[PDB]
Design a binder for this molecule. Sequence first.
Ligand SMILES: *[C@H](C)[C@H]1/C(=C/c2[nH]c(/C=C3N=C(/C=C4\NC(=O)C(CC)=C4C)C(C)=C\3CCC(=O)O)c(CCC(=O)O)c2C)NC(=O)[C@@H]1C
Ligand SMILES: *[C@H](C)[C@H]1/C(=C/c2[nH]c(/C=C3N=C(/C=C4\NC(=O)C(CC)=C4C)C(C)=C\3CCC(=O)O)c(CCC(=O)O)c2C)NC(=O)[C@@H]1C
Ligand SMILES: *[C@H](C)[C@H]1/C(=C/c2[nH]c(/C=C3N=C(/C=C4\NC(=O)C(CC)=C4C)C(C)=C\3CCC(=O)O)c(CCC(=O)O)c2C)NC(=O)[C@@H]1C
Ligand SMILES: *[C@H](C)[C@H]1/C(=C/c2[nH]c(/C=C3N=C(/C=C4\NC(=O)C(CC)=C4C)C(C)=C\3CCC(=O)O)c(CCC(=O)O)c2C)NC(=O)[C@@H]1C
Ligand SMILES: *[C@H](C)[C@H]1/C(=C/c2[nH]c(/C=C3N=C(/C=C4\NC(=O)C(CC)=C4C)C(C)=C\3CCC(=O)O)c(CCC(=O)O)c2C)NC(=O)[C@@H]1C
Ligand SMILES: *[C@H](C)[C@H]1/C(=C/c2[nH]c(/C=C3N=C(/C=C4\NC(=O)C(CC)=C4C)C(C)=C\3CCC(=O)O)c(CCC(=O)O)c2C)NC(=O)[C@@H]1C
Ligand SMILES: *[C@H](C)[C@H]1/C(=C/c2[nH]c(/C=C3N=C(/C=C4\NC(=O)C(CC)=C4C)C(C)=C\3CCC(=O)O)c(CCC(=O)O)c2C)NC(=O)[C@@H]1C
Ligand SMILES: *[C@H](C)[C@H]1/C(=C/c2[nH]c(/C=C3N=C(/C=C4\NC(=O)C(CC)=C4C)C(C)=C\3CCC(=O)O)c(CCC(=O)O)c2C)NC(=O)[C@@H]1C
Ligand SMILES: CCC1=C(C)/C(=C/C2=NC(=C\c3[nH]c(/C=C4\NC(=O)[C@H](C)[C@H]4CC)c(C)c3CCC(=O)O)/C(CCC(=O)O)=C2C)NC1=O
Ligand SMILES: CCC1=C(C)/C(=C/C2=NC(=C\c3[nH]c(/C=C4\NC(=O)[C@H](C)[C@H]4CC)c(C)c3CCC(=O)O)/C(CCC(=O)O)=C2C)NC1=O
Lengths: 160, 160, 160, 160, 66, 48, 161, 161, 161, 161, 161
Amino acid sequence: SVVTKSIVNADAEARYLSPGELDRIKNFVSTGERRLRIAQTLTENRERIVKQAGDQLFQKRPDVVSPGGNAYGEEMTATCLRDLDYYLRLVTYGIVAGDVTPIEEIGLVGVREMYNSLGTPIPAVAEGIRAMKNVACSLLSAEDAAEAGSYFDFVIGAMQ
Amino acid sequence: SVVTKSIVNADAEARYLSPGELDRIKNFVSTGERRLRIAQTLTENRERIVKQAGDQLFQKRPDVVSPGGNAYGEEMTATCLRDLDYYLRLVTYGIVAGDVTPIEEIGLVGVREMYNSLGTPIPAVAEGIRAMKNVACSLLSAEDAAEAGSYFDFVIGAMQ
Amino acid sequence: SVVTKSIVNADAEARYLSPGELDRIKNFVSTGERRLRIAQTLTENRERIVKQAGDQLFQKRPDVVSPGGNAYGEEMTATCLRDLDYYLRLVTYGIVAGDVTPIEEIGLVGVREMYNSLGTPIPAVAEGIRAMKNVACSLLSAEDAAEAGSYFDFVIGAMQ
Amino acid sequence: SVVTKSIVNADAEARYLSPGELDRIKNFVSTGERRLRIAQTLTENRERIVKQAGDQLFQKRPDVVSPGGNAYGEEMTATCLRDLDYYLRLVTYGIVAGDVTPIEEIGLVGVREMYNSLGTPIPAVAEGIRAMKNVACSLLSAEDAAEAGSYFDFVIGAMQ
Amino acid sequence: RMFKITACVPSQTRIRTQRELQNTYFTKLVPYENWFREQQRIQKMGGKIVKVELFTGKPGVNTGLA
Amino acid sequence: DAIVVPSFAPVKPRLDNTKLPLLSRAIAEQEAKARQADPSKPRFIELG
Amino acid sequence: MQDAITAVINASDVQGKYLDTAAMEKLKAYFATGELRVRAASVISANAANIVKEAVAKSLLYSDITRPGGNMYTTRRYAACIRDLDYYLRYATYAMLAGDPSILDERVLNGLKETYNSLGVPIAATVQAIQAMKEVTASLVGADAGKEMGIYFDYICSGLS
Amino acid sequence: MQDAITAVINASDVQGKYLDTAAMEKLKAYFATGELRVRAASVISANAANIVKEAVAKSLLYSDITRPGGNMYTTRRYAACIRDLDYYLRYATYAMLAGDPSILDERVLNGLKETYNSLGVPIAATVQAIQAMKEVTASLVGADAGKEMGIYFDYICSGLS
Amino acid sequence: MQDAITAVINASDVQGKYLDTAAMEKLKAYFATGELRVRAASVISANAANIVKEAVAKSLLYSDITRPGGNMYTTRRYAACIRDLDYYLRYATYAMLAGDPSILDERVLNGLKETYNSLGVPIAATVQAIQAMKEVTASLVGADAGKEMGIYFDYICSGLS
Amino acid sequence: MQDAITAVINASDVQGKYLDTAAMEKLKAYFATGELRVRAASVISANAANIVKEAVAKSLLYSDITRPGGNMYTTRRYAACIRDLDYYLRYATYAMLAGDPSILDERVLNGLKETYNSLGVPIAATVQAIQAMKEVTASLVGADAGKEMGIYFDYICSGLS
Amino acid sequence: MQDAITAVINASDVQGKYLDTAAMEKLKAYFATGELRVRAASVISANAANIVKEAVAKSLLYSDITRPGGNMYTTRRYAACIRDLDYYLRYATYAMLAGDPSILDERVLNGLKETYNSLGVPIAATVQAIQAMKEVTASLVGADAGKEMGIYFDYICSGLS
Ligand SMILES: *[C@H](C)[C@H]1/C(=C/c2[nH]c(/C=C3N=C(/C=C4\NC(=O)C(CC)=C4C)C(C)=C\3CCC(=O)O)c(CCC(=O)O)c2C)NC(=O)[C@@H]1C
Ligand SMILES: *[C@H](C)[C@H]1/C(=C/c2[nH]c(/C=C3N=C(/C=C4\NC(=O)C(CC)=C4C)C(C)=C\3CCC(=O)O)c(CCC(=O)O)c2C)NC(=O)[C@@H]1C
Ligand SMILES: *[C@H](C)[C@H]1/C(=C/c2[nH]c(/C=C3N=C(/C=C4\NC(=O)C(CC)=C4C)C(C)=C\3CCC(=O)O)c(CCC(=O)O)c2C)NC(=O)[C@@H]1C
Ligand SMILES: *[C@H](C)[C@H]1/C(=C/c2[nH]c(/C=C3N=C(/C=C4\NC(=O)C(CC)=C4C)C(C)=C\3CCC(=O)O)c(CCC(=O)O)c2C)NC(=O)[C@@H]1C
Ligand SMILES: *[C@H](C)[C@H]1/C(=C/c2[nH]c(/C=C3N=C(/C=C4\NC(=O)C(CC)=C4C)C(C)=C\3CCC(=O)O)c(CCC(=O)O)c2C)NC(=O)[C@@H]1C
Ligand SMILES: *[C@H](C)[C@H]1/C(=C/c2[nH]c(/C=C3N=C(/C=C4\NC(=O)C(CC)=C4C)C(C)=C\3CCC(=O)O)c(CCC(=O)O)c2C)NC(=O)[C@@H]1C
Ligand SMILES: *[C@H](C)[C@H]1/C(=C/c2[nH]c(/C=C3N=C(/C=C4\NC(=O)C(CC)=C4C)C(C)=C\3CCC(=O)O)c(CCC(=O)O)c2C)NC(=O)[C@@H]1C
Ligand SMILES: *[C@H](C)[C@H]1/C(=C/c2[nH]c(/C=C3N=C(/C=C4\NC(=O)C(CC)=C4C)C(C)=C\3CCC(=O)O)c(CCC(=O)O)c2C)NC(=O)[C@@H]1C
Ligand SMILES: CCC1=C(C)/C(=C/C2=NC(=C\c3[nH]c(/C=C4\NC(=O)[C@H](C)[C@H]4CC)c(C)c3CCC(=O)O)/C(CCC(=O)O)=C2C)NC1=O
Ligand SMILES: CCC1=C(C)/C(=C/C2=NC(=C\c3[nH]c(/C=C4\NC(=O)[C@H](C)[C@H]4CC)c(C)c3CCC(=O)O)/C(CCC(=O)O)=C2C)NC1=O
């Protein structure tokens, strides 16, 4: 959260929050209702966002669901869809937080190491999250969808 | 300034400006006109603030203007009044800029070193600036007084 | 000013200011504060005063603003209001001055020739000033109305 | 003259007169009528220009005609007016020529040396010629006065 | 007045292929002057401060400090 | 005995802002619109 | 190193569940209180030195601990004591702005008890002194903000105790 | 001619705006000065002839200017010199009360230097006499009145020279 | 580091005057333009990689510079070259957001000349590359914002040359 | 770093001869002057801040330099200026105690003019300020110790110039 | 050296374009103001020495600088000071005639600050002196031309700073 970052900066310089930093947290406080609304529609439509995006991902690169792909078979495909749901709710946490610190901590540091240990292709993960972003944008208003899209963009960049 | 502070932090992080930081810059841009008007009324009432607040300070702290005090003698008292004018000037800059960066750079950094060499008690300087804050509050509306009061608060806190 | 009128008379007389003339100057000095307060009231209520006066004047002589009239149409009606506002500002100047000297040099010398050239009706202009006098009496204190009414009355007589 | 100065520059760079230089030569010759007319006015009023301007100089600088001064006595003052007469003559020559090289050739090369040898104050001579210029303004129409004024300007500027 | 300290430094910033146990868990002798500055740095890093002892010096001494 | 990094010298920028393209457009607009007629006001012919 | 929002989302993450309406209710409450918190922080910062002076005068001064052989006797120890109280106040206002006690545990109370007992600093006296700070701060910030200031002051008292 | 109030009114008319706060305080400064002005004017009229006599005695009397061939060495010339000095004094007293130099510019200082020059009367001698009259007038009027009278008389002397 | 606002107030500070009406007009102009700046920064931040890619392809590729012994040959040097181009674009957009070139001179161009001369980097090739960046980024942000990015890119070019 | 004794013995050491009688005489002279050197150092150690304050007031205050835009203006710059004066006075007392100017050349005057030129500090004004310091310190320590302090203060001035 | 016309055509030449309509605008504006420039140049050519005389008297005389030890003291240095003022005024009239400040930068302000610092000349005092020149020359040429002279006198001041 931006509140956390402001406290960290002031603590580093051993100063009480400057008036500008205090104004920053004031602005974020007022923005909170809008951010909560965006996260609320995401969680309300979590099932729909995950499902059609997953089908689009498998259609995009069918080698994943083909034999020899990491997600070959119903159980493997189910767990990958579970991962897509995981990342969506990570993005919801980031949206309410206002910064990407929660997303990074929960599911980014060592992203390549985790999924290559599993044998999963990280570019394919990127396409899956891209599909989630498109479906999420449809369920968001255009003004709101800019805010959520930024967190999605950070996540796909980190996937790569 | 908001722009210079955001760009400093982004430069250290080696990132193009974050979307949230750009949003803060947008809001600062829109509120700039209110900031300019607040600074305008302060500079218009420069004379009244200085003389009224200075007389309040001397009442609160008769020791400084007493013989054996730092400001005793019309000339010394006048130069202290000039210092109060200087600090009001820095506060007007800070109100326009949106951060303390100009205030602290121009003055209020080596403040203890300078004033120790000069012989003045820096808490007494802080009392004078507090009196200026009170007069400026009277000259401002409740909303406007809150914005200007924060910069005055930073100055007095740094003096202490 | 009243002092200016006395100075002109003294210059023609080739004599120092008369003791009684200086006495009237002293009276003008005493009444400077009261005259300034009355002028401030007029300036404060300027828009409403001439707005009501314009409605009253157009009601009294509907042919000023009717088709074929001098001020027929919105733009010319606004210009008529400006001419009334010019007169109102001159009356405020004259109230501050304490003498007819300010008005006579502006709007009371050759005004008949100018209005005849443009085509506007001089009698209707005079009625408009009278409507202003009534509005000012409503918006001012009783003795303030008497003095302001006197200056207004000189303007009305000049229009005749 | 303009013709001789143009020829001199063309001589230095070893070029036949450029078409623009030829135009300037033609123009100066044609407007020679106006030039002669201005010079005729000045020579017609040589007496009053020198006399009035010299009296203005004496009044502006009483020290020059004071006892123990350069101009004390009617004999010395006669010589002083003679010098002003010489400079007016040079100015008329310069107007006729259309260039200041006749004026410089005759009476501005070494004026400091000559006048310091005589004891005369060089700034005072400059102020006398300024007086001649001011007298010239009334005698010459505004358009004409600007033309003669420039030659007077060169004389005073070299004098100082 | 050297302080003997025992502390942890877990780091989420990166995953380290090279040895990290040495930095992670350690005991060090920090002088009295340094201890506040180091305490703030390690506390900021978020590591748990397991143990503190006054290895050198005495618990309270008005003058004659090391 | 020389100091390779004696101190970092401040520099006075050569290119003066408020001549830069964006501010110059804005300065033109604020000036010209101020001289022009003002929306939402009763008296506009009086002002010089 | 957490605030109210971080705590809410982290608790939901520990459960593994998505954001719930009750969790969003907690977030809404913090946002509603946010502006109140901010102005309190500004007041605390400006008067921080005076808060410490008044609280020390009302708690520690003219007593045996400042008298010789009392652990705050000698200029060096007095300076350290007032500095530590300054730091307590600054970290307290950090925690108040965050709306969480995580900063207090992570950056203040960790190792603080161990160090204080190692040097034999009187922990009871410090707790009393920061209680004095608490009432001075309550007066300055107001009753509303004072209650929030009180819980974090008491949290620090608990850690020392 | 103009006054302090009239000049502010002229400036406001040029601007085209009703009385401002700045206009109010400029006018109020004239209103406050009025008491000093009128008292000084009465004193100036009472001692006007004595002021002229004192000034010429201090500056030009018992000098070569009074001695034969000095532009004041005739009964007629001496009377004319006293007359012109009285003219300057009267217009200056007017202008001091008015508060503006427009009266002096319009009447007192119009072509005066050129006429004096052509006659041969010394501009410097007149300027010295005017300064002497200013000193006498300041003494008679008082300190605050002398400062204002100095400004007006300074305009006349500077315009003459 | 400076901003347009910071530069204006610093100039007024050097003179020692509170912000004049002319200074206020400059500040108001910058505020009016701030939204346009924010938009342009949002655009090129998203397309930063594409801008570098196009500029490199247009000017730096399929030439001797990126073939054996060319200073861009070797993967280490190719990575360094594209990193420098992102450096230039990032600081250029910082300067565009600020409305002041002080950022570029203080950071980007302090001894950049000297480093490139030492390294053997061709100054002319870098200038060509950032010229290509200028063309691409101007097209992306539009004409009015492009002429603002253009001046900062050309300032970097002049510093290099 | 050297002093009078170290310089004498080093000069003999280069020859490789034992201390001859002339070298002993130089050492005796330093020992004779050492007592007054010690007294002077103790005196200006007591008045260090006061000496700086007096010199700053004498030449550096109520002047354009401390007025806005003058280089002693700005609180940081004022602190830096008085810090430099503290530096100069302390090194002057070091050199006076040692009896050799080697400390000044080694630790003060090397690369000092270049840094001041880069910073924009006026070398002339610094020289004036330390001249004022020289006056004050000479008065405090006495005349003969004042001669000794003066040579090293002049040494510093020459290095700056 | 450049002028307004030369600058316009040089900029168009750099961009390889025939004169634009905007370039034609700038050329027309210079031609419209050109005759005013010529008249002003004639005026201050005649009064160059007088302008320097007044400005020297109005800020540089009867001051600590011209008293002993103030740099302007000594007849040499006085002659150098007035000569520099004549330099500044002459180059200001060159710049005003040209309609471009390139002359000032190319022939006056290049190295001038460096030389003044080495000489010990007060850059602040020279700036004050040329501002006094600015006032005097504005009075002589008139308001319109005085504005034009000012934008080049201020340019010289900024270079000196
Ligand atoms: C996997 C089988 C289990 C598991 C592991 C887990 N370990 C850590 C953190 C650390 N592990 C070590 C151990 C070593 N460091 C070394 O250098 C070597 C080689 C000599 C070893 C064996 C250390 C020092 C740490 C801490 C510092 C660090 O991050 O490296 C974690 C992270 C704990 C945390 O949250 O900070 C985890 C999760 N976890 C499991 O569930 C398995 C049973
Ligand atoms: C006296 C010359 C100046 C002055 C002093 C003053 N001091 C206090 C209160 C306290 N002073 C101390 C000082 C010390 N404690 C130490 O351990 C040591 C070194 C061994 C010192 C010097 C302390 C601890 C206190 C407060 C508690 C106590 O008494 O122990 C006061 C009272 C404060 C007040 O105004 O309320 C004063 C006035 N006052 C002067 O005017 C002198 C310049
Ligand atoms: C004041 C209320 C009481 C008191 C205090 C006292 N404390 C110390 C020494 C230390 N205190 C700390 C604690 C902290 N360090 C930190 O960085 C932070 C912020 C998170 C805290 C709270 C530490 C590390 C030390 C030791 C090193 C140091 O001095 O900084 C002393 C000094 C003891 C000594 O000098 O021997 C004192 C006196 N003393 C009292 O009497 C009060 C009851
Ligand atoms: C081939 C197996 C794959 C592939 C590659 C591809 N590469 C390029 C262009 C370039 N490649 C390099 C590579 C190097 N530069 C070096 O210094 C070194 C180390 C010695 C290497 C390996 C460079 C510099 C370029 C840039 C162009 C140039 O050299 O001037 C292309 C062309 C890209 C384009 O569209 O311009 C391609 C296609 N492509 C494949 O499909 C293979 C999987
Ligand atoms: C003021 C309310 C109190 C006070 C002050 C006092 N100050 C001085 C002298 C100086 N003050 C300054 C201050 C500044 N310089 C800066 O650049 C800035 C930031 C823009 C500041 C605030 C300086 C430079 C001086 C030195 C003199 C000078 O300006 O040249 C004095 C005079 C000291 C003396 O005796 O000589 C005084 C008295 N005095 C009080 O009583 C107040 C509590
Ligand atoms: C005071 C008499 C004049 C003055 C001084 C001023 N100096 C600086 C900055 C620096 N001065 C030094 C010099 C020294 N460093 C040393 O270690 C020693 C002793 C061994 C000396 C003599 C240095 C290194 C600096 C720069 C680093 C720093 O800030 O300390 C400044 C600051 C300039 C700036 O803006 O950064 C100033 C103002 N100023 C005056 O007006 C006096 C004439
Ligand atoms: C003297 C016998 C004659 C005379 C002189 C006069 N001089 C001035 C003004 C100045 N004179 C100087 C002279 C010097 N400055 C130097 O550095 C040196 C060498 C050490 C000298 C000789 C200066 C600098 C001035 C300017 C004023 C100042 O010092 O600040 C005046 C005043 C001029 C004025 O109107 O301002 C006068 C009158 N006057 C005579 O009648 C004598 C014949
Ligand atoms: C007068 C306002 C101030 C002043 C001046 C002063 N200047 C110098 C010396 C020099 N000035 C220059 C400057 C120029 N040279 C140029 O060619 C031009 C125009 C292109 C300029 C502006 C130079 C080169 C010198 C040094 C060489 C020389 O002597 O001419 C001095 C002399 C310093 C000395 O002692 O050697 C002085 C005194 N002095 C003041 O007090 C004023 C504030
Ligand atoms: C060419 C024509 C002409 C005349 C006549 C003339 C007279 C003249 N008489 C003067 C003085 C004077 N004149 C008198 C005259 C008199 N007092 C008496 O008791 C007597 C009754 C009487 C003469 C018999 C006195 C007393 C003064 C001096 C006044 C003073 O300063 O107190 C003065 C002023 C002092 C001076 O000279 O500077 C002048 C100018 N000036 C002229 O230009
Ligand atoms: C705009 C107002 C105004 C002015 C200024 C004015 C001046 C004026 N002064 C004049 C003469 C004169 N003025 C003086 C005055 C003086 N003698 C001295 O010794 C002194 C230096 C000096 C003044 C104290 C003298 C002596 C004459 C000539 C008198 C004569 O010989 O006929 C004349 C010529 C007619 C005459 O002789 O009176 C005029 C017109 N007239 C005006 O209407």
